[PDB]
Amino acid sequence: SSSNYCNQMMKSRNLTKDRCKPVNTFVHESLADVQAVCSQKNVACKNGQTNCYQSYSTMSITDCRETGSSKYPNCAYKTTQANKHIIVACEGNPYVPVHFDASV
């Protein structure tokens, strides 16, 4: 819990207020462009279910991963910025992303 983007956003978005979550990805794209991935390339999910979809293009993402020294209450994260294709599992009506399956 310090000033880098991952420590700040993991806290603000209520991911580390009561636990340290090991890894989390944030996507820096407009919400509707992230929602548009549910009608893009259909692929199988890691678990073999087939409601996963891969973005046609790469998207700006930040990976946040807990360092080896992190312990609740002071969660500590390494921040890695990258542009990657995201894979999301979709459900509902409207058919929207409900889980992040990976980045590729």
Partner: peptide, 15 residues
């Protein structure tokens, strides 16, 4: 209370 779609946005989207 929070739907799964809402939870995905809170945890993963930073428009």
């Amino acid at each position: 209370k929070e739907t799964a779609a809402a939870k995905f946005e809170r945890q993963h989207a930073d428009s």
